[PDB]
């Protein structure tokens, strides 16, 4: 309900003054958030994703950085797979269940 | 004279490479997993002669599916350049097209035609299943319209 | 894109299950596409007095 | 401030009030912050701008249809907080977010304003006054704000050389350098001149005059005229405004030789105008009759 | 749209085209702005 | 309105038109300079004058919430037509 | 709470035995595998005949930019560049000015197709509706410039597909 | 998009090395140029095949640096949605799973 | 302040070392990298760029950016030898479809506005 | 109820980890400088580079600590602090379910002490520092680059690096190869001027001086 | 306190080498550093 | 019903399993420390899932 | 200059050179290298084709979105010469064929297709022309090739007064039908030079040298009006060249000797061919005429370029060739040729 974080509706857009500013500003500089670091993971499909996010206290973020379910388990590929076949290793990369759009960034 | 003859000829040649042309797949992001939907049962990319499936060596178009970055660029120069002709490369996605959203990277080169020629371009974030088999259609009409023996006749 | 109660039989047969309980497929069971339109409710912070942003 | 608008009834609008091709005046969107009335009366001194009626039909403006043309008028539009004031020549031609801002110095008076020129996509749109304390407060005079399109008219891009008719057709730049090398080439001494204008930068002139003086020409002139005889320009203290702007916001008495400061530099004469309200300055003048 | 007339105004084309590219009636890109800074037209009278 | 150029190109509603020389026209040749017939600069001013007679008018270009935000400007000077700066639909008071 | 996957270990009573040395011996759960595929095999196939058939749609869908105009035929861009300074990939280029009649236009209004990514955010920005983006998908361009559109390009999508357009926001506009 | 420069004795393999970078785009390096509300779909195009859950995780970081929560429709739609994710991309996983071990018809 | 801690060196003499038989492993390795690339480079004018890259940072006087360049050119070498990199990283030193870029004031004058 | 926006506030597990945290303090005082919990329930530990090993093997190994699974491991450049580089590990336990993360600082030479041996998921995540900050670690059993294209220059996340990188690559026929080229932009990147110029957050004020 | 094998190390830092910045961009290039003038409108 | 249709498929098919049964074990010690996570913890058999915990 | 023609940018794709090409008859050998180095330094050249834009696709990636733009144009049309020159700054002539076609024959691919470029060229206004003949050009040479570009060279500076025509000798490069020629010539038997071909001298040149020499002499002042010729540093007698270039290729080398009237004969065999003869009774009259030397000529090392010696980069050409056996030999392996120095 809070404005401020969230774009108001398009009707009180278009007759209030409150939402049209604060669409106005959200579209334009967006919500500033306060300064501060976090570290926030859920269990995606493929595994556990987390971002940590470091904002610097603006209408801008200052670090996002990627913790993607695939990068981790390609770093232990190799002790994964140690003897098994080439068959095998394509058998591994399966239920490794690894895109290469999130380990790679 | 000769156009009634040669024109019949390469009418039968264009049609025959219109309706078997064979995608070599390529690809390289969710533009990938989009083409994988324009295959499965619904759109059913492999009624049309389309294959999908195709090796390198045997392929006639290259579909470039995903943003392509810098690392990429000498493999993908390689798998056209060795590309029997005819080879037609369409491109498929903002990403491939030029830039993307990632335009303003430092590893993305800003289009796929600043590494490979192409022939049709496709846009759309992902291009929807039925946007890309368009663009394939779309090419389709385009070896409709060759005219190879003509010209050479007319050379 | 229903079928003759011969195949009909065959295919559940090999399948081994009813499967005309439920199809693949989607006939007419789908949701209309021309829904009349909705009136969105609002949220908590709608009222006009004590909504001081303060608190 | 809130997140939601409780008003239920109509708002009110008021009829807009020109008051030049300068500022854009949208007077509905006012606040009556009665910023631009304490500028007009103390800052410019031009009392012209005020409030008309009461209650919430109270409208400020100037009443009669009059033009508020001083020296000082275009930075009303800087501290109207509202886009109640605007730039007419700037009118909507970039949203403010975009334009890349880069610090300067106006040229088109002597004050030599600090100022920020506000470019989007290689291109100036306006110019902005910057804080300095000691040359210009905040404020420029309308003369330095709204002369950016002086830069986008009449300019010179190509160099040009007269033609066998005697006309000047563009041409690259070799011709054109080695003309002048060899017309420089064959005259020395004092038959080569060189007059600079009046925007001319210093770097250039040190050039101009060191290259002059590679062939002894000596006659490095100016448009200005400065008395020479005596000590001329060879004393800082001939030629300066010695006690800075700032030390004029303590003196007493202030004399001015036949000069028109409201027109000549009108950041000076805004300082003046300070001191004579704040430090009750007695200014006299002797000279033209110029209020 | 038989039974849905769709609401008819002016600047509606009355004639659907097909993608026109291809065809020399396909769509070229240009600049849709004015003139940026402005170039100094030499005098005409002679140099004298 | 759209007209010809001097070369015989169409103008834009901007104004543009590329000039005699102006190298950049060879994108055109075997092609054509898409150029919108539909003027919004004309297609606003045959519009009638709306002749509401009150003070101050609201204005939100018509559809509700489909339309732009609503305004009020003011039906008050004598010598000319109030408008809304959005859509443009030209307001005056029924000559008082 | 949580439930063992494979822990059902085979019973070793001889009737056990012989049933999985049967399945082993005499192929069963291949044959499973190949009759289930036989029954997929007389079924009713799914497949939409393109281009003659599409595929099903939504008000909401996100496709080809356009510049909307108002019932009068004004163009409803005021031209506040809220669409550029939103726009993730900065596809949008706006440069305004105050118009003959006065109405604030843009002189130039471009969107670099190949650079957009589709995501609509331009017209949830819009507080005229201007800018929005059209059902159609059916653009898939020969030449890297047809992608490039310019403001008479936009202006023109918005005067062909128009009922379209006005059709799904009047079905959507309850929505957003 | 992948590399295995593999050392082997013929079949069972000694040492693998991948070589991810083969799709790399700055993200990392674009979040910090746009707002917080631009930076939203890099997490839909991150990993493409649980799109909602990318966008989950995103979203709640943002607004649980804002001491902010959404509310109890807006939570029940994130998991109904993300749910339906789980499914799109467990479906990816083992169908394309099969398709390198030959099966095709799943 | 000026106390500091080492990568590997202690002191220039035995980072010196270090590029020492990192230019000898550069040496043993263009010939064999220009058969095995089927490089267009010819052995002389493979030498020469790998001393005038290493006369390229001759201003350092640092130790620990001596272990610095030293370990990003073993990183180099290991790209190289087991042909991770290709073959037109390995041109990318050489400046082919670079044009060439004048010098003298003069030249830079009738180019363009650019220091 | 009267908050039904502001997201709830939990001090019990704000208590509890402070509670650990003063643990964690005393337990190895050689090394940490100062911890301290976010108002989200986050707690933070700052440690001296010395202990990347030591701290983190503590807290892989300890019974009370029990933290074995390397959620990430990241680098945030900030050039104004004197070491400009700041590395962050983040650990989860499973025992005693919680998040934790240390944080140590290094500039661009001096090495920082890789810890591969206490969590051997970190080598990856290590040569991505050293790919893409700089950050050299030592006796990192293989520090190649990792992320980046072959034959690269500099560390693109420090925040000096342009967003546009220096050199794109494309087809040359002339030399009928790919060929890297220095950049030239079709349109350059507009740098939008947000964070308007009125303070946002009362509470976190920076002090004058 | 501290032991690492520490060493003197007089001159300043020089990683414009390790910083990759091509030789025209690290020599020609001239930076300001500034408090920036707040928007006279604001 | 195509869910179960494709576990029959695969589940207890011969060249299935024999292809992928016992290839790669990944022990659950081993597992946590290579900061794995998702179904490669679940498949070795750790009792941890974010959804719950 | 015009106000969209300043030069601008820093020579990469987009920068705006200032140059407006047309490069005529790109579409092959030169014409790609040349739209390369136009294309490179960025300029809006309106390369024109007569065969279907499949054969032109290697064009688009030598160039910056919004160039080479493509222009259908015919041979007999001096509207369509008209249409692709009407917006440009200079127009560039390669058009020219190796082979008699049935329905082109020689002079007017040389005199009346330059002579109608040059005359539809000056009408319409274009600053500089620059057209391309063979430095061998006689107007009594055995070789009908050679006198129709002479009458072609005197048609053009006649119409065009300030054309800037250029005379290359024999040009190598990738796909040279020079190099690959005589490489080649082992398919048909041993190579049977004319007479063992130990009278014949051969002064190549590198297609990027003439390529770079064509586009200084686009940004050279004093170009117009001038006759540039251009050779190779080196020149070899035709026997040794061809040893050189088998050793490259490691081909077994077998000289046969040939009467010129039997070549005629296997020239007259080979132009029955209905595609692309290898040869032709033409070509025969080509190979054995060794260039001259024409000092008086401006040459190629005045426009600025440096000559590449046929050494340095005959690996590329001849790589191809290679077998298996030599295919991972590197140049030095082959001593360079015994060249015929002044
Ligand atoms: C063994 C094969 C025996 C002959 C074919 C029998 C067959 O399958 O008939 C279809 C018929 C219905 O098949 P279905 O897939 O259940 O139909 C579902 C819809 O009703 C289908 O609805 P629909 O509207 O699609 O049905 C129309 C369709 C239905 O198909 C037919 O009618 C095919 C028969 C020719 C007409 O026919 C067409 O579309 C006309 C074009 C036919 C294409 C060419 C067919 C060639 C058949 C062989 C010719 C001789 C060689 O089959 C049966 O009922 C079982 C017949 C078993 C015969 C066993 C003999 C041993
Ligand atoms: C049973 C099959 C019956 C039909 C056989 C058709 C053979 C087609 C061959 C491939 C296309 C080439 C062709 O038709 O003529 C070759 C001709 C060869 O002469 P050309 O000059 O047209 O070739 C194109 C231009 N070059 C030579 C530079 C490649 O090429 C074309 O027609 C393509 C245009
Ligand atoms: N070693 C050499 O090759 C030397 C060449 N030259 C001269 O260079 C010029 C070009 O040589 P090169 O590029 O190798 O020749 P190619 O035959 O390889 O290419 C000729 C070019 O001109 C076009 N062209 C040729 N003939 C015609 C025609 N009749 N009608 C229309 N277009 C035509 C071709 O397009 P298309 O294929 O569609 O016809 C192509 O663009 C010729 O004038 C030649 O005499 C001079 C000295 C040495
Ligand atoms: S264009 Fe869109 S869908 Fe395609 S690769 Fe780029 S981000 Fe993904
Ligand atoms: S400065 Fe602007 S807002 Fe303030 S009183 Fe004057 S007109 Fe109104
Ligand atoms: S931006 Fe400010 S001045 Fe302009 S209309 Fe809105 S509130 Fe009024
Ligand atoms: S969808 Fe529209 S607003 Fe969003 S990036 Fe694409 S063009 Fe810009
Ligand atoms: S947001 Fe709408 S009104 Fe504003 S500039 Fe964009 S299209 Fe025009
Ligand atoms: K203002
Ligand atoms: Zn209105």
Same mark, same amino acid.
């Given at each position: ?105 | +004279? ?44 492999? +009624? ?14 290259? !579909? ?22 005819? +080879? ?26 600043? !590494?490979?020629?192409?022939? !049709? ?14 663009? !394939? ?19 | ?55 | ?8 009834? %109509? ?33 410019? %001194? ?90 210009? @407060? ?93 000590? %001329? ?16 916001? @303590? ?35 002797? %000279?033209?009759?110029?209020? | ?5 769709? $609401? ?23 600049? $849709? $702005? ?10 005409? $009278?002679?140099?004298? | ?96 | ?176 | ?106 | ?115 | ?209 | ?42 | 019903?195509? &869910? ?10 011969? &060249? ?6 016992? &290839? ?21 058999? &750790? ?7 | ?342």
């Amino acid at each position: 309900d809070d404005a401020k974080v969230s774009p108001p509706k398009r009707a009180e857009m278009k007759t209030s003054m409150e939402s049209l500013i604060h669409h106005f500003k959200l579209y334009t500089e967006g919500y500033q958030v306060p300064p501060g670091a976090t570290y926030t993971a859920i269990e995606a499909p493929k595994g556990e994703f987390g971002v940590y996010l470091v904002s610097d206290g603006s209408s801008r973020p200052y670090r996002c950085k990627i913790k993607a379910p695939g990068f981790a388990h390609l770093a232990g590929l190799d002790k994964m797979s140690k003897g098994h076949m080439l068959a095998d290793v394509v058998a591994i990369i399966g239920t490794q269940d690894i895109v290469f759009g999130e380990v790679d960034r | +004279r000769g156009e009634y003859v040669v024109a019949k000829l390469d009418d039968l040649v264009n049609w025959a490479r219109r309706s078997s042309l064979w995608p070599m797949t390529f690809g390289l992001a969710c533009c990938a997993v989009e083409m994988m939907h324009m295959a499965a049962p619904r759109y059913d990319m492999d +009624r049309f002669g389309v294959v999908f499936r195709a090796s390198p060596r045997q392929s006639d178009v290259m !579909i470039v599916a995903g943003t392509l970055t810098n690392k990429m660029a000498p493999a993908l120069r390689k798998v056209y350049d060795q590309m029997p002709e005819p +080879r037609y490369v369409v491109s498929m996605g903002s990403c491939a097209n030029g830039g993307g959203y990632y335009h303003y990277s430092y590893s993305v080169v800003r289009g796929c035609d600043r !590494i490979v020629p192409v022939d !049709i371009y496709v846009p759309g974030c992902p291009p929807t299943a039925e946007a890309l088999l368009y663009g !394939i259609l779309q090419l389709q009409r385009k070896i409709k319209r060759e005219k190879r023996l003509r010209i050479w006749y007319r050379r | 894109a229903s079928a003759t109660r011969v195949i009909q039989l065959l295919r559940n047969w090999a399948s081994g299950r009813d499967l005309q309980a439920k199809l693949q497929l989607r006939y007419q069971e789908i949701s209309k596409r021309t829904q009349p339109p909705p009136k969105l409710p609002v949220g908590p912070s709608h009222k006009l007095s004590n909504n001081y942003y303060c608190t | 401030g809130s997140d939601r608008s409780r008003f239920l009834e %109509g708002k009110r609008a008021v009829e807009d009030k020109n008051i030049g091709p300068l500022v854009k005046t949208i007077m509905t969107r006012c606040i009556q912050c009665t910023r631009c009335i304490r500028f007009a009366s103390e800052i410019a %001194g031009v009392d012209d701008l005020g409030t008309t009626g009461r209650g919430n039909d109270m409208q400020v403006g100037t009443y009669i249809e009059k033009m508020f043309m001083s020296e000082l008028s275009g930075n009303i539009i800087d501290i109207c907080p509202v886009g109640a004031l605007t730039s007419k020549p700037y009118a909507f031609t970039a949203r403010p977010w975009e334009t890349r801002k880069t610090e300067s110095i106006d040229v088109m008076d002597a004050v030599g304003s600090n100022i920020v020129v506000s470019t989007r996509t290689g291109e100036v749109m306006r110019i902005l006054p910057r804080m300095h304390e000691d040359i210009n @407060e905040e404020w420029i005079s309308d003369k330095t704000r709204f002369a950016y399109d002086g830069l986008k008219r009449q300019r010179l891009t190509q160099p040009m050389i007269r033609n066998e008719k005697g006309l000047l057709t563009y041409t690259t730049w070799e011709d054109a350098l080695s003309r002048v090398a060899g017309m420089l080439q064959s005259f020395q001494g004092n038959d080569v001149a060189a007059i600079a204008g009046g925007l001319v930068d210093a770097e250039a002139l040190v050039a101009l005059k060191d290259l002059l003086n590679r062939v002894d020409s000596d006659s490095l002139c100016t448009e200005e005229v400065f008395p020479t005889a005596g000590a %001329g320009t060879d004393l800082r203290s001939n030629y300066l405004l010695n006690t800075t702007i700032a030390g004029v916001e @303590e003196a007493d008495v202030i004399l001015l030789v036949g000069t028109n400061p409201r027109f000549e530099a009108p950041l000076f004469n805004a300082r003046i105008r300070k001191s004579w309200l704040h430090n009750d300055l007695k200014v006299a003048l002797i %000279g033209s009759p110029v209020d | 749209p038989t039974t849905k007339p769709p $609401t008819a105004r002016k600047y509606i084309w009355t004639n659907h085209k097909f993608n026109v590219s291809g065809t020399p009636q396909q769509y070229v890109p240009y600049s $849709t $702005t004015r003139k940026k800074i402005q170039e100094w037209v030499p005098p005409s $009278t002679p140099y004298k | 309105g759209v007209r010809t150029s001097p070369t015989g190109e169409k103008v834009t509603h901007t104004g543009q038109a590329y000039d005699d020389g102006d190298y950049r026209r060879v994108r055109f040749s075997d092609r054509q300079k898409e150029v919108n017939e539909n003027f919004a600069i004309d297609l606003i001013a045959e519009q009638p004058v709306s002749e509401v007679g009150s003070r101050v008018i609201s204005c939100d270009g018509g559809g509700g919430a489909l339309g732009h935000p609503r305004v009020y400007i003011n039906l008050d000077k004598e010598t000319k037509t109030g408008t809304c700066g959005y859509c443009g639909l030209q307001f005056r008071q029924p000559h008082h | 709470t949580y439930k063992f996957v494979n822990m059902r270990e085979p019973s070793m009573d001889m009737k056990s035995v012989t049933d999985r040395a049967a399945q082993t011996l005499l192929w069963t759960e291949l044959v499973r595998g190949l009759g289930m595929t036989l029954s997929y095999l007389f079924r009713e196939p799914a497949t939409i005949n393109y281009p003659f058939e599409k595929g099903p749609l939504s008000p909401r869908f996100r496709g080809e930019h356009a510049l909307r105009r108002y019932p009068s035929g004004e163009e409803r861009c005021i031209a506040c560049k809220l669409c550029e300074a939103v726009c993730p990939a900065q596809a949008i280029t706006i440069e305004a000015e105050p118009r003959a009649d006065g109405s604030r236009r843009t002189t130039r209004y471009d969107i670099d197709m190949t650079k957009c990514i589709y995501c609509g955010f331009c017209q949830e920005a819009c507080p005229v509706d201007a800018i929005v983006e059209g059902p159609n998908f059916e653009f898939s361009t020969e030449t890297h410039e047809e992608l490039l559109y310019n403001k008479e390009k936009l202006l023109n999508n918005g005067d062909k597909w128009e009922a379209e357009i006005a059709a799904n926001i009047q079905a959507d506009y309850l929505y957003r | 998009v992948l590399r295995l420069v593999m050392e082997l004795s013929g079949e069972m393999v000694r040492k693998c090395d991948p070589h991810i970078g083969l799709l790399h785009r700055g993200t990392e390096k674009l979040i910090e140029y746009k707002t917080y509300l631009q930076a939203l779909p890099y997490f839909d195009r991150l990993d493409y095949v649980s799109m909602m859950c990318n966008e989950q995780a995103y979203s709640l970081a943002v607004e649980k640096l804002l001491n902010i929560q959404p509310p109890p429709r807006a939570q029940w739609i994130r998991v109904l949605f993300g749910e339906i994710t789980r499914l799109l991309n467990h479906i990816m996983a083992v169908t394309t799973h099969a398709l390198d071990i030959g099966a095709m018809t799943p | 302040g000026t106390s500091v801690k080492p990568i590997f060196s202690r002191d220039m003499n035995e980072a010196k070392r270090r590029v020492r038989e990192l230019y000898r492993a550069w040496y043993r390795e263009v010939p064999n990298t220009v058969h095995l690339f089927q490089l267009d480079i010819s052995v002389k004018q493979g030498r020469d760029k790998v001393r005038e890259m290493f006369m390229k940072n001759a201003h350092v006087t640092d130790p620990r950016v001596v272990d610095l360049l030293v370990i990003k050119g073993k990183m180099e070498l290991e790209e190289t030898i087991n042909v991770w990199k290709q073959r037109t990283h390995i041109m990318r030193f050489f400046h082919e479809t670079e044009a060439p870029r004048p010098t003298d004031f003069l030249s830079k004058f009738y180019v363009g506005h650019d220091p | 109820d009267t908050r039904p926006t502001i997201r709830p506030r939990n001090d019990v597990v704000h208590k509890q980890l402070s509670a650990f945290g003063q643990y964690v303090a005393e337990i190895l005082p050689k090394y940490v400088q100062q911890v301290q919990v976010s108002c989200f329930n986050e707690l933070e530990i700052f440690i001296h580079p010395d202990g990347v090993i030591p701290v983190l093997t503590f807290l892989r190994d300890h019974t009370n600590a029990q933290f074995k699974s390397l959620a990430d491991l990241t680098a945030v450049d900030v050039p104004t602090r004197q070491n400009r580089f700041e590395i962050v590990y983040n650990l989860l336990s499973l025992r005693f379910n919680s998040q934790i993360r240390v944080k140590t600082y290094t500039d661009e030479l001096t090495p920082i002490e890789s810890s591969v041996t206490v969590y051997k998921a970190a080598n990856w995540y290590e040569r991505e520092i050293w790919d893409m900050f700089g950050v050299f670690f030592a006796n990192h059993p293989d520090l190649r680059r990792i992320l980046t294209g072959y034959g690269f220059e500099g560390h693109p996340f420090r925040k000096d690096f342009p967003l546009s990188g220096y050199v794109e690559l494309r087809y040359d026929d002339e030399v009928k190869r790919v060929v890297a080229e220095p950049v030239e932009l079709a349109q350059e990147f507009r740098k939008f001027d947000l964070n308007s110029p009125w303070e946002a957050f009362p509470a976190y004020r920076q002090p004058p001086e | 306190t501290q032991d690492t094998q520490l060493i003197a190390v007089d001159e300043k830092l020089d990683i414009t080498t390790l910083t990759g910045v091509p030789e025209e961009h690290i020599k020609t290039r001239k930076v300001r550093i500034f408090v920036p003038a707040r928007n006279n409108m604001q | 019903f195509r &869910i179960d249709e494709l576990e029959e498929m695969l589940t207890n098919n011969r &060249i299935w399993r024999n292809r992928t049964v016992d &290839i790669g074990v990944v022990t659950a010690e081993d597992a946590l420390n290579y900061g794995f996570s998702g179904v490669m913890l679940r498949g070795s058999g &750790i009792q941890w899932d974010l959804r719950k915990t | 200059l015009h106000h969209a023609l300043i030069p601008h940018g820093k020579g990469g794709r987009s920068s705006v050179s200032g140059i407006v090409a047309t490069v005529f008859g790109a579409t092959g050998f030169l014409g790609r290298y040349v739209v390369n180095h136009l294309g490179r330094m960025g300029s809006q050249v309106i390369v024109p084709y007569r065969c279907e834009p499949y054969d032109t696709m290697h064009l688009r990636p030598m160039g910056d979105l919004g160039q080479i733009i493509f222009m259908e144009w015919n041979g007999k049309d001096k509207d369509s010469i008209r249409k692709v020159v009407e917006h440009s700054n200079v127009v560039i002539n390669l058009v020219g064929r190796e082979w008699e076609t049935k329905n082109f024959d020689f002079e007017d691919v040389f005199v009346k297709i330059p002579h109608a470029i040059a005359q539809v060229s000056k009408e319409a206004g274009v600053e500089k022309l620059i057209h391309i003949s063979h430095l061998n050009a006689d107007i009594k040479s055995p070789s009908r090739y050679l006198r129709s570009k002479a009458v072609g060279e005197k048609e053009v500076r006649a119409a065009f007064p300030e054309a800037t025509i250029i005379k290359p000798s024999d040009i190598f490069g990738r796909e040279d039908r020079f190099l690959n020629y005589f490489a080649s010539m082992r398919w048909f038997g041993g190579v049977p030079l004319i007479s063992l071909g130990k009278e014949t001298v051969k002064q190549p040149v590198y297609i990027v040298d003439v390529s770079k020499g064509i586009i200084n002499a686009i940004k050279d002042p004093d170009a117009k009006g001038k006759t540039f010729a251009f050779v190779g540093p080196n020149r070899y007698l035709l026997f040794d060249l061809v040893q050189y270039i088998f050793a490259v290729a490691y081909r077994p080398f077998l000289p046969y000797p040939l009467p010129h009237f039997a070549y005629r004969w296997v020239g007259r065999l080979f132009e029955v061919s209905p595609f692309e003869p290898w040869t032709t009774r033409d070509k025969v009259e080509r190979v054995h005429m060794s260039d001259m030397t024409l000092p008086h000529l401006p040459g190629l090392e005045d426009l600025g370029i440096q000559a590449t010696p046929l050494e340095l980069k005959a690996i590329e050409v001849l790589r191809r060739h290679r077998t298996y056996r030599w295919l991972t030999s590197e140049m030095e392996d082959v001593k360079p040729a015994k060249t015929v120095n002044i």
